[PDB]
PDB file of C-alpha atoms and ligand atoms in Angstrom:
ATOM      1  CA  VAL A   1      96.719  93.377  58.008  1.00 26.29           C
ATOM      2  CA  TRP A   2      96.606  91.566  61.362  1.00 29.41           C
ATOM      3  CA  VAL A   3      99.647  91.460  62.162  1.00 33.13           C
ATOM      4  CA  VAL A   4     100.735  94.953  61.515  1.00 32.99           C
ATOM      5  CA  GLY A   5      97.173  95.907  63.596  1.00 34.71           C
ATOM      6  CA  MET A   6      98.053  94.500  66.468  1.00 32.75           C
ATOM      7  CA  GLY A   7     102.396  95.627  67.213  1.00 30.05           C
ATOM      8  CA  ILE A   8     100.778  99.303  66.952  1.00 26.33           C
ATOM      9  CA  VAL A   9      98.783  98.611  69.977  1.00 26.06           C
ATOM     10  CA  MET A  10     100.882  96.510  72.051  1.00 27.25           C
ATOM     11  CA  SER A  11     103.890  99.738  71.352  1.00 26.59           C
ATOM     12  CA  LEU A  12     101.098 102.070  71.951  1.00 24.79           C
ATOM     13  CA  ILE A  13     100.562 100.473  75.082  1.00 22.48           C
ATOM     14  CA  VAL A  14     104.298  99.751  75.976  1.00 21.95           C
ATOM     15  CA  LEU A  15     104.660 103.821  75.623  1.00 26.03           C
ATOM     16  CA  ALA A  16     101.978 104.850  77.800  1.00 24.80           C
ATOM     17  CA  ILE A  17     102.632 102.723  80.504  1.00 25.47           C
ATOM     18  CA  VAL A  18     106.115 103.989  80.265  1.00 23.52           C
ATOM     19  CA  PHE A  19     105.744 107.509  80.244  1.00 22.22           C
ATOM     20  CA  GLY A  20     103.376 107.571  82.654  1.00 22.56           C
ATOM     21  CA  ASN A  21     105.581 105.558  85.439  1.00 19.62           C
ATOM     22  CA  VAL A  22     108.672 107.404  84.741  1.00 17.38           C
ATOM     23  CA  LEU A  23     106.587 110.695  85.260  1.00 18.18           C
ATOM     24  CA  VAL A  24     105.463 110.167  88.685  1.00 17.39           C
ATOM     25  CA  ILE A  25     108.841 108.615  89.858  1.00 15.13           C
ATOM     26  CA  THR A  26     110.784 111.428  88.402  1.00 17.26           C
ATOM     27  CA  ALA A  27     108.717 114.083  89.893  1.00 16.59           C
ATOM     28  CA  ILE A  28     108.878 112.608  93.455  1.00 15.92           C
ATOM     29  CA  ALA A  29     112.495 112.201  93.513  1.00 17.18           C
ATOM     30  CA  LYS A  30     113.384 115.771  92.079  1.00 18.83           C
ATOM     31  CA  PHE A  31     110.104 117.807  94.324  1.00 16.66           C
ATOM     32  CA  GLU A  32     110.699 117.763  97.978  1.00 20.07           C
ATOM     33  CA  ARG A  33     107.634 118.440  98.843  1.00 19.01           C
ATOM     34  CA  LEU A  34     106.177 115.250  97.476  1.00 17.33           C
ATOM     35  CA  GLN A  35     108.041 113.268  99.435  1.00 17.77           C
ATOM     36  CA  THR A  36     105.586 112.111 102.437  1.00 16.24           C
ATOM     37  CA  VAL A  37     105.127 109.115 104.186  1.00 14.44           C
ATOM     38  CA  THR A  38     102.411 108.726 101.665  1.00 15.19           C
ATOM     39  CA  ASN A  39     103.856 108.933  98.061  1.00 15.50           C
ATOM     40  CA  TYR A  40     106.686 105.904  99.117  1.00 19.13           C
ATOM     41  CA  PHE A  41     103.604 103.522  98.478  1.00 17.60           C
ATOM     42  CA  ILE A  42     102.985 105.467  94.991  1.00 14.94           C
ATOM     43  CA  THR A  43     106.962 104.968  94.525  1.00 17.12           C
ATOM     44  CA  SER A  44     106.862 100.828  94.965  1.00 15.86           C
ATOM     45  CA  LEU A  45     103.618 100.843  93.062  1.00 15.02           C
ATOM     46  CA  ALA A  46     105.451 102.846  90.048  1.00 12.83           C
ATOM     47  CA  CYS A  47     108.500 101.104  90.153  1.00 10.35           C
ATOM     48  CA  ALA A  48     106.602  97.564  89.264  1.00  9.73           C
ATOM     49  CA  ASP A  49     104.627  99.076  86.477  1.00 11.44           C
ATOM     50  CA  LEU A  50     107.539 100.349  85.143  1.00 13.45           C
ATOM     51  CA  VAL A  51     109.694  97.153  85.714  1.00 12.82           C
ATOM     52  CA  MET A  52     106.322  95.156  83.905  1.00 12.98           C
ATOM     53  CA  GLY A  53     105.941  97.271  80.863  1.00 13.45           C
ATOM     54  CA  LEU A  54     109.945  97.409  80.252  1.00  9.39           C
ATOM     55  CA  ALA A  55     109.926  93.567  80.704  1.00  9.19           C
ATOM     56  CA  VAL A  56     107.204  91.760  80.454  1.00  6.71           C
ATOM     57  CA  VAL A  57     104.968  93.202  77.666  1.00  5.89           C
ATOM     58  CA  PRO A  58     107.424  93.972  74.796  1.00  4.20           C
ATOM     59  CA  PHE A  59     108.700  89.852  75.095  1.00  3.90           C
ATOM     60  CA  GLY A  60     105.019  88.942  75.444  1.00  4.52           C
ATOM     61  CA  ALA A  61     104.370  90.515  72.090  1.00  6.49           C
ATOM     62  CA  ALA A  62     107.306  89.411  70.530  1.00  7.62           C
ATOM     63  CA  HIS A  63     106.554  85.991  71.250  1.00  4.29           C
ATOM     64  CA  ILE A  64     102.251  86.131  70.271  1.00  2.00           C
ATOM     65  CA  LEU A  65     103.573  88.528  67.061  1.00  5.72           C
ATOM     66  CA  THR A  66     106.763  85.750  66.149  1.00  8.80           C
ATOM     67  CA  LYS A  67     104.498  82.769  66.857  1.00  5.98           C
ATOM     68  CA  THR A  68     107.710  81.266  68.502  1.00  4.01           C
ATOM     69  CA  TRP A  69     110.336  81.539  71.464  1.00  2.00           C
ATOM     70  CA  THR A  70     113.403  82.350  69.577  1.00  2.00           C
ATOM     71  CA  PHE A  71     115.339  82.541  72.646  1.00  2.00           C
ATOM     72  CA  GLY A  72     116.792  79.792  74.741  1.00  2.00           C
ATOM     73  CA  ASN A  73     114.767  77.852  77.571  1.00  2.00           C
ATOM     74  CA  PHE A  74     116.541  79.124  80.375  1.00  2.23           C
ATOM     75  CA  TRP A  75     115.141  82.817  79.334  1.00  3.00           C
ATOM     76  CA  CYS A  76     111.448  81.860  79.283  1.00  2.00           C
ATOM     77  CA  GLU A  77     111.851  80.386  83.638  1.00  2.00           C
ATOM     78  CA  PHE A  78     113.146  84.059  83.813  1.00  2.00           C
ATOM     79  CA  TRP A  79     110.307  85.838  82.177  1.00  2.00           C
ATOM     80  CA  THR A  80     107.731  84.100  84.198  1.00  2.00           C
ATOM     81  CA  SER A  81     109.210  84.515  87.633  1.00  2.00           C
ATOM     82  CA  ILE A  82     109.469  88.529  86.063  1.00  2.00           C
ATOM     83  CA  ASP A  83     105.985  88.176  84.988  1.00  2.00           C
ATOM     84  CA  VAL A  84     104.321  87.489  88.057  1.00  2.00           C
ATOM     85  CA  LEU A  85     106.732  88.901  90.368  1.00  2.00           C
ATOM     86  CA  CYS A  86     105.513  91.973  89.257  1.00  3.67           C
ATOM     87  CA  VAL A  87     102.054  90.843  89.272  1.00  5.06           C
ATOM     88  CA  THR A  88     101.940  89.972  92.365  1.00  7.82           C
ATOM     89  CA  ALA A  89     103.684  92.797  93.891  1.00  4.36           C
ATOM     90  CA  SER A  90     101.629  95.361  92.164  1.00  3.66           C
ATOM     91  CA  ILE A  91      98.069  94.734  93.814  1.00  2.82           C
ATOM     92  CA  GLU A  92      99.779  94.401  97.636  1.00  2.00           C
ATOM     93  CA  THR A  93     101.143  97.855  97.533  1.00  2.00           C
ATOM     94  CA  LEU A  94      97.346  98.823  96.389  1.00  2.00           C
ATOM     95  CA  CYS A  95      96.260  96.558  99.710  1.00  2.00           C
ATOM     96  CA  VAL A  96      99.138  98.830 101.540  1.00  3.55           C
ATOM     97  CA  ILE A  97      97.693 102.313  99.978  1.00  2.00           C
ATOM     98  CA  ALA A  98      94.211 101.331 101.500  1.00  2.00           C
ATOM     99  CA  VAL A  99      95.485 100.040 104.939  1.00  2.41           C
ATOM    100  CA  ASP A 100      97.089 102.985 105.508  1.00  3.16           C
ATOM    101  CA  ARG A 101      94.138 105.680 103.876  1.00  5.20           C
ATOM    102  CA  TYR A 102      91.674 103.518 106.488  1.00  7.43           C
ATOM    103  CA  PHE A 103      94.284 104.119 109.459  1.00  8.75           C
ATOM    104  CA  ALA A 104      93.926 108.167 108.756  1.00  7.75           C
ATOM    105  CA  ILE A 105      90.254 108.126 108.737  1.00  8.46           C
ATOM    106  CA  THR A 106      89.521 105.960 111.782  1.00  8.36           C
ATOM    107  CA  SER A 107      92.144 107.024 113.842  1.00  8.02           C
ATOM    108  CA  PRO A 108      93.207 110.977 113.561  1.00  9.93           C
ATOM    109  CA  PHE A 109      94.648 111.289 116.456  1.00 12.76           C
ATOM    110  CA  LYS A 110      97.586 108.198 116.566  1.00 14.40           C
ATOM    111  CA  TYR A 111      98.460 108.489 112.683  1.00 17.44           C
ATOM    112  CA  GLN A 112     101.303 109.921 112.940  1.00 18.58           C
ATOM    113  CA  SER A 113     102.757 107.824 116.074  1.00 16.76           C
ATOM    114  CA  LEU A 114     101.822 104.713 113.740  1.00 18.15           C
ATOM    115  CA  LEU A 115     103.193 105.174 110.586  1.00 20.02           C
ATOM    116  CA  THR A 116     106.673 106.888 110.598  1.00 16.24           C
ATOM    117  CA  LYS A 117     109.101 107.044 107.639  1.00 16.31           C
ATOM    118  CA  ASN A 118     111.504 104.308 109.389  1.00 15.77           C
ATOM    119  CA  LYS A 119     108.313 101.810 109.700  1.00 14.57           C
ATOM    120  CA  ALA A 120     107.371 102.529 105.644  1.00 12.50           C
ATOM    121  CA  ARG A 121     110.325 101.208 104.589  1.00 11.20           C
ATOM    122  CA  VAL A 122     109.946  97.672 106.722  1.00  9.77           C
ATOM    123  CA  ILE A 123     106.580  97.302 105.400  1.00 10.57           C
ATOM    124  CA  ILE A 124     107.486  98.036 101.355  1.00  9.34           C
ATOM    125  CA  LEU A 125     110.854  95.595 101.638  1.00  9.42           C
ATOM    126  CA  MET A 126     108.117  92.888 103.587  1.00 11.55           C
ATOM    127  CA  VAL A 127     105.840  93.082 100.748  1.00 10.25           C
ATOM    128  CA  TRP A 128     108.581  92.811  98.146  1.00 10.50           C
ATOM    129  CA  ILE A 129     110.284  89.803 100.061  1.00  9.28           C
ATOM    130  CA  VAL A 130     106.772  88.155  99.851  1.00 10.74           C
ATOM    131  CA  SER A 131     106.321  88.639  96.467  1.00  6.38           C
ATOM    132  CA  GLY A 132     109.458  87.313  95.411  1.00  5.79           C
ATOM    133  CA  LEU A 133     108.615  84.291  97.950  1.00  6.61           C
ATOM    134  CA  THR A 134     106.212  83.127  95.346  1.00  3.01           C
ATOM    135  CA  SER A 135     107.605  83.997  91.958  1.00  6.48           C
ATOM    136  CA  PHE A 136     111.021  83.136  91.933  1.00 10.29           C
ATOM    137  CA  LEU A 137     111.221  80.325  94.272  1.00  9.76           C
ATOM    138  CA  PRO A 138     109.221  77.836  93.099  1.00 10.27           C
ATOM    139  CA  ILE A 139     108.952  78.623  89.377  1.00  7.31           C
ATOM    140  CA  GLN A 140     113.171  78.451  89.274  1.00  7.31           C
ATOM    141  CA  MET A 141     112.657  75.154  91.882  1.00  6.13           C
ATOM    142  CA  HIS A 142     110.837  73.642  89.250  1.00  6.51           C
ATOM    143  CA  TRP A 143     108.074  73.056  91.541  1.00  8.44           C
ATOM    144  CA  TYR A 144     104.960  74.221  89.682  1.00 11.18           C
ATOM    145  CA  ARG A 145     105.387  71.894  86.850  1.00 11.44           C
ATOM    146  CA  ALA A 146     102.254  70.295  85.391  1.00  9.13           C
ATOM    147  CA  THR A 147     102.651  65.879  85.066  1.00 10.15           C
ATOM    148  CA  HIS A 148     101.232  65.626  81.729  1.00 14.45           C
ATOM    149  CA  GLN A 149     102.125  64.723  77.646  1.00 15.22           C
ATOM    150  CA  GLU A 150     101.582  68.067  76.220  1.00 13.62           C
ATOM    151  CA  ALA A 151     103.582  69.665  79.537  1.00 15.61           C
ATOM    152  CA  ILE A 152     106.342  67.423  79.199  1.00 16.11           C
ATOM    153  CA  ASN A 153     106.524  67.820  75.132  1.00 17.80           C
ATOM    154  CA  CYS A 154     106.496  71.775  75.746  1.00 17.00           C
ATOM    155  CA  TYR A 155     109.058  71.532  78.271  1.00 15.78           C
ATOM    156  CA  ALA A 156     111.050  69.167  76.021  1.00 17.94           C
ATOM    157  CA  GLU A 157     111.134  71.939  72.678  1.00 20.57           C
ATOM    158  CA  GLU A 158     113.331  74.964  73.204  1.00 20.35           C
ATOM    159  CA  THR A 159     111.296  77.294  70.977  1.00 23.13           C
ATOM    160  CA  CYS A 160     107.873  76.088  72.331  1.00 25.07           C
ATOM    161  CA  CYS A 161     107.132  77.880  75.784  1.00 20.82           C
ATOM    162  CA  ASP A 162     103.650  78.213  77.680  1.00 21.68           C
ATOM    163  CA  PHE A 163     102.224  78.421  80.875  1.00 21.65           C
ATOM    164  CA  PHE A 164     101.719  74.516  82.505  1.00 23.69           C
ATOM    165  CA  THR A 165     101.003  74.382  86.163  1.00 22.43           C
ATOM    166  CA  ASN A 166      99.438  72.587  89.068  1.00 23.83           C
ATOM    167  CA  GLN A 167      96.471  72.731  90.833  1.00 22.46           C
ATOM    168  CA  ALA A 168      97.910  73.521  94.520  1.00 27.20           C
ATOM    169  CA  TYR A 169     100.699  75.871  92.681  1.00 23.36           C
ATOM    170  CA  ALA A 170      97.628  77.898  90.873  1.00 27.70           C
ATOM    171  CA  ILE A 171      95.341  77.729  93.953  1.00 29.05           C
ATOM    172  CA  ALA A 172      97.896  79.055  96.743  1.00 29.46           C
ATOM    173  CA  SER A 173      99.150  81.607  93.925  1.00 26.90           C
ATOM    174  CA  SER A 174      95.580  82.879  93.092  1.00 28.76           C
ATOM    175  CA  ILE A 175      94.893  83.142  96.944  1.00 32.36           C
ATOM    176  CA  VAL A 176      98.292  84.957  97.888  1.00 32.90           C
ATOM    177  CA  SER A 177      97.976  86.716  95.020  1.00 31.18           C
ATOM    178  CA  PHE A 178      94.676  88.059  94.840  1.00 28.33           C
ATOM    179  CA  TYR A 179      91.873  87.241  96.900  1.00 26.92           C
ATOM    180  CA  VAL A 180      93.287  88.319 100.554  1.00 27.33           C
ATOM    181  CA  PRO A 181      94.054  91.823  99.191  1.00 26.49           C
ATOM    182  CA  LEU A 182      90.512  92.190  97.888  1.00 27.76           C
ATOM    183  CA  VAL A 183      88.829  91.106 100.948  1.00 25.25           C
ATOM    184  CA  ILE A 184      90.910  93.159 102.698  1.00 28.76           C
ATOM    185  CA  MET A 185      90.283  96.551 100.381  1.00 25.03           C
ATOM    186  CA  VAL A 186      86.897  95.843 100.466  1.00 24.25           C
ATOM    187  CA  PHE A 187      86.699  95.759 104.026  1.00 20.80           C
ATOM    188  CA  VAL A 188      88.411  99.119 104.792  1.00 20.61           C
ATOM    189  CA  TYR A 189      86.899 101.395 101.706  1.00 20.04           C
ATOM    190  CA  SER A 190      82.641 100.035 103.278  1.00 20.48           C
ATOM    191  CA  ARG A 191      84.165 101.373 106.434  1.00 22.81           C
ATOM    192  CA  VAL A 192      85.666 104.443 104.831  1.00 22.02           C
ATOM    193  CA  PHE A 193      82.716 105.364 103.079  1.00 19.22           C
ATOM    194  CA  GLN A 194      80.391 104.552 106.267  1.00 19.83           C
ATOM    195  CA  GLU A 195      82.935 106.884 108.011  1.00 19.41           C
ATOM    196  CA  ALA A 196      82.214 109.925 105.314  1.00 18.43           C
ATOM    197  CA  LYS A 197      78.515 108.942 105.404  1.00 16.56           C
ATOM    198  CA  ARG A 198      78.776 109.776 108.997  1.00 17.57           C
ATOM    199  CA  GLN A 199      80.727 113.384 108.409  1.00 18.67           C
ATOM    200  CA  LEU A 200      77.952 113.987 105.602  1.00 18.58           C
ATOM    201  CA  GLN A 201      75.378 113.558 108.261  1.00 16.95           C
ATOM    202  CA  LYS A 202      76.491 115.408 111.244  1.00 17.19           C
ATOM    203  CA  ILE A 203      77.479 118.672 108.387  1.00 15.65           C
ATOM    204  CA  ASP A 204      73.969 118.663 107.683  1.00 16.09           C
ATOM    205  CA  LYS A 205      72.328 118.314 110.786  1.00 16.83           C
ATOM    206  CA  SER A 206      74.248 121.070 112.386  1.00 17.05           C
ATOM    207  CA  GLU A 207      74.416 123.483 109.495  1.00 15.76           C
ATOM    208  CA  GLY A 208      71.430 122.623 107.434  1.00 13.78           C
ATOM    209  CA  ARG A 209      69.384 125.611 107.218  1.00 14.45           C
ATOM    210  CA  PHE A 210      72.393 127.358 104.662  1.00 15.22           C
ATOM    211  CA  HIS A 211      72.694 126.002 101.513  1.00 16.85           C
ATOM    212  CA  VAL A 212      76.495 125.340 102.467  1.00 17.24           C
ATOM    213  CA  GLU A 213      76.922 110.940  98.815  1.00 19.69           C
ATOM    214  CA  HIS A 214      78.365 111.909  95.478  1.00 21.18           C
ATOM    215  CA  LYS A 215      82.004 112.337  96.399  1.00 20.88           C
ATOM    216  CA  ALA A 216      82.169 109.621  97.950  1.00 18.74           C
ATOM    217  CA  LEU A 217      80.540 107.307  95.714  1.00 15.74           C
ATOM    218  CA  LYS A 218      82.139 108.467  92.439  1.00 11.68           C
ATOM    219  CA  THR A 219      85.606 108.442  93.909  1.00 11.75           C
ATOM    220  CA  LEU A 220      85.502 104.848  96.148  1.00 12.14           C
ATOM    221  CA  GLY A 221      83.620 103.645  92.024  1.00 12.56           C
ATOM    222  CA  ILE A 222      86.554 104.768  90.110  1.00  9.91           C
ATOM    223  CA  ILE A 223      88.831 102.777  92.939  1.00 10.26           C
ATOM    224  CA  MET A 224      87.433 100.010  93.290  1.00 11.87           C
ATOM    225  CA  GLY A 225      85.577  99.480  89.617  1.00 12.85           C
ATOM    226  CA  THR A 226      89.445  99.714  87.675  1.00 11.51           C
ATOM    227  CA  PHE A 227      90.918  97.055  89.431  1.00 12.18           C
ATOM    228  CA  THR A 228      87.947  94.436  89.991  1.00 13.39           C
ATOM    229  CA  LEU A 229      87.050  94.800  85.894  1.00 10.93           C
ATOM    230  CA  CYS A 230      90.373  94.578  85.200  1.00 12.75           C
ATOM    231  CA  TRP A 231      92.072  91.714  87.424  1.00 12.61           C
ATOM    232  CA  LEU A 232      88.693  89.694  88.265  1.00 10.27           C
ATOM    233  CA  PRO A 233      87.885  88.135  85.214  1.00 10.98           C
ATOM    234  CA  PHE A 234      91.418  86.441  85.360  1.00  5.09           C
ATOM    235  CA  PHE A 235      92.005  85.207  88.603  1.00  8.99           C
ATOM    236  CA  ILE A 236      88.499  83.423  87.881  1.00 10.31           C
ATOM    237  CA  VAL A 237      89.489  81.454  85.014  1.00  9.65           C
ATOM    238  CA  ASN A 238      93.234  80.939  86.671  1.00 11.44           C
ATOM    239  CA  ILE A 239      91.510  78.530  89.645  1.00 12.28           C
ATOM    240  CA  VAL A 240      88.884  77.262  86.978  1.00 11.17           C
ATOM    241  CA  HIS A 241      91.235  75.941  84.334  1.00 10.52           C
ATOM    242  CA  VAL A 242      92.494  73.289  86.449  1.00 14.27           C
ATOM    243  CA  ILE A 243      89.551  72.179  87.409  1.00 12.71           C
ATOM    244  CA  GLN A 244      88.103  70.980  83.963  1.00 12.94           C
ATOM    245  CA  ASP A 245      90.012  70.867  81.116  1.00 13.43           C
ATOM    246  CA  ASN A 246      88.019  71.499  78.143  1.00 13.11           C
ATOM    247  CA  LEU A 247      86.163  73.998  80.363  1.00 13.43           C
ATOM    248  CA  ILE A 248      88.816  77.468  79.236  1.00 15.52           C
ATOM    249  CA  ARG A 249      90.264  77.509  75.863  1.00 17.90           C
ATOM    250  CA  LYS A 250      94.098  79.289  75.900  1.00 15.30           C
ATOM    251  CA  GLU A 251      92.855  81.995  73.592  1.00 16.56           C
ATOM    252  CA  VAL A 252      90.398  83.184  76.250  1.00 18.73           C
ATOM    253  CA  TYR A 253      93.329  82.722  78.829  1.00 19.47           C
ATOM    254  CA  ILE A 254      95.624  84.590  77.068  1.00 18.88           C
ATOM    255  CA  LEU A 255      93.087  87.652  76.498  1.00 17.85           C
ATOM    256  CA  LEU A 256      92.147  87.800  79.891  1.00 20.99           C
ATOM    257  CA  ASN A 257      95.333  87.375  80.973  1.00 20.28           C
ATOM    258  CA  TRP A 258      96.128  90.561  78.771  1.00 19.87           C
ATOM    259  CA  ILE A 259      93.564  92.863  79.920  1.00 20.17           C
ATOM    260  CA  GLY A 260      94.960  93.041  83.135  1.00 21.59           C
ATOM    261  CA  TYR A 261      98.108  94.217  82.097  1.00 24.50           C
ATOM    262  CA  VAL A 262      97.040  97.486  81.006  1.00 22.42           C
ATOM    263  CA  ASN A 263      95.998  98.269  84.838  1.00 24.72           C
ATOM    264  CA  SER A 264      99.323  99.217  85.389  1.00 20.10           C
ATOM    265  CA  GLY A 265      99.259 101.979  82.942  1.00 22.87           C
ATOM    266  CA  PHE A 266      95.986 103.587  84.736  1.00 24.16           C
ATOM    267  CA  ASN A 267      97.314 103.940  87.845  1.00 22.63           C
ATOM    268  CA  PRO A 268      99.099 106.727  87.671  1.00 27.09           C
ATOM    269  CA  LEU A 269      95.459 109.042  86.906  1.00 27.98           C
ATOM    270  CA  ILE A 270      94.184 107.349  89.439  1.00 22.99           C
ATOM    271  CA  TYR A 271      96.629 108.009  92.204  1.00 19.21           C
ATOM    272  CA  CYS A 272      98.457 111.049  90.995  1.00 17.35           C
ATOM    273  CA  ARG A 273      95.411 113.284  90.735  1.00 18.48           C
ATOM    274  CA  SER A 274      96.250 115.637  93.153  1.00 16.31           C
ATOM    275  CA  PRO A 275      96.722 119.423  92.967  1.00 14.47           C
ATOM    276  CA  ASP A 276     100.496 118.579  94.013  1.00 15.07           C
ATOM    277  CA  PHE A 277     101.428 116.087  91.485  1.00 15.04           C
ATOM    278  CA  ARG A 278      99.623 118.719  88.915  1.00 16.04           C
ATOM    279  CA  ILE A 279     102.036 121.261  89.668  1.00 18.31           C
ATOM    280  CA  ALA A 280     105.123 119.172  89.718  1.00 19.51           C
ATOM    281  CA  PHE A 281     104.089 117.319  86.291  1.00 17.13           C
ATOM    282  CA  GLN A 282     103.756 121.057  84.909  1.00 16.97           C
ATOM    283  CA  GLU A 283     107.009 122.195  86.088  1.00 18.42           C
ATOM    284  CA  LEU A 284     108.383 118.634  84.743  1.00 15.65           C
ATOM    285  CA  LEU A 285     107.574 119.824  81.239  1.00 15.68           C
ATOM    286  CA  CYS A 286     106.582 122.442  79.099  1.00 18.35           C
TER     287      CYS A 286
HETATM  288  C1  G1I B 301     102.645  84.084  82.516  1.00 19.34           C
HETATM  289  N1  G1I B 301     101.391  84.774  83.275  1.00 19.34           N
HETATM  290  C2  G1I B 301     100.393  84.448  84.648  1.00 19.34           C
HETATM  291  C3  G1I B 301     100.239  83.301  84.709  1.00 19.34           C
HETATM  292  C4  G1I B 301      99.854  82.416  86.061  1.00 19.34           C
HETATM  293  C5  G1I B 301      99.879  83.810  87.135  1.00 19.34           C
HETATM  294  C6  G1I B 301     100.094  84.974  86.210  1.00 19.34           C
HETATM  295  C7  G1I B 301      99.945  86.289  87.412  1.00 19.34           C
HETATM  296  C8  G1I B 301      99.835  86.043  88.805  1.00 19.34           C
HETATM  297  C9  G1I B 301      99.409  84.797  89.199  1.00 19.34           C
HETATM  298  O1  G1I B 301      99.598  84.492  91.015  1.00 19.34           O
HETATM  299  C10 G1I B 301     100.121  83.480  88.793  1.00 19.34           C
HETATM  300  O2  G1I B 301      99.445  82.767  89.162  1.00 19.34           O
HETATM  301  C11 G1I B 301     100.273  85.546  85.064  1.00 19.34           C
HETATM  302  O3  G1I B 301     100.941  86.704  84.832  1.00 19.34           O
END
């Protein structure tokens, strides 16, 4: 009953991810009003999420359900590289969005000059190049491999493929993928909240006698509680399991990894709540 039951959940996850991340892309492509410098970062994020949902989730689900890797030994390194690439490219895009929002409020007069359609493309290409220099190059050159008997036995068997990595690669990959964007987003959003509070105070001092921070708190909570709660638990055990051998089990690692995969299915709800997006979604369907 467990085999039949979980397959339904995995298929539902796949369908939700694909349907969520294709609609945004086609709405942005079809409509000329939504083509804005802001909306290119959402385009890149949606592309990364769609690639993840199509390439990573189905094969991981099949590997779990079948319990053996029926495909060749060459196709598992490619799968791991794709997974790492998508994961590390789906977070720096959020960091870029946060920085772009910071520059709008902090410098209102100079926002148009600093951000131009030519610079957005360069930023996106740099993000994707950096993502590809930590996923394909070290994995495909066999620099991440660990040196112990279980790892060698797993490497020499075609039907078995698990993740065994070194201390240095794990630390470097986690630092590049998660922690630096986390610090940058924390600083950015704290400053934005400070500016919003100052504006509210000024309005209250000016027009106080007439009736005419819940909004900022709710928005920032939705922004920063669906990302930290989804990715932070995994990137701690990622550091831990290479320092203490018996502290972290394999099942906990796999489940905490799969919890962070569903974040790609939530992004359209969080970042595409604008009325302009709603009108486009209504026009496409119905
Ligand atoms: C196969 N799962 C991988 C394992 C390690 C890893 C992931 C994502 C980002 C990283 O920086 C990593 O080091 C996970 O997606």
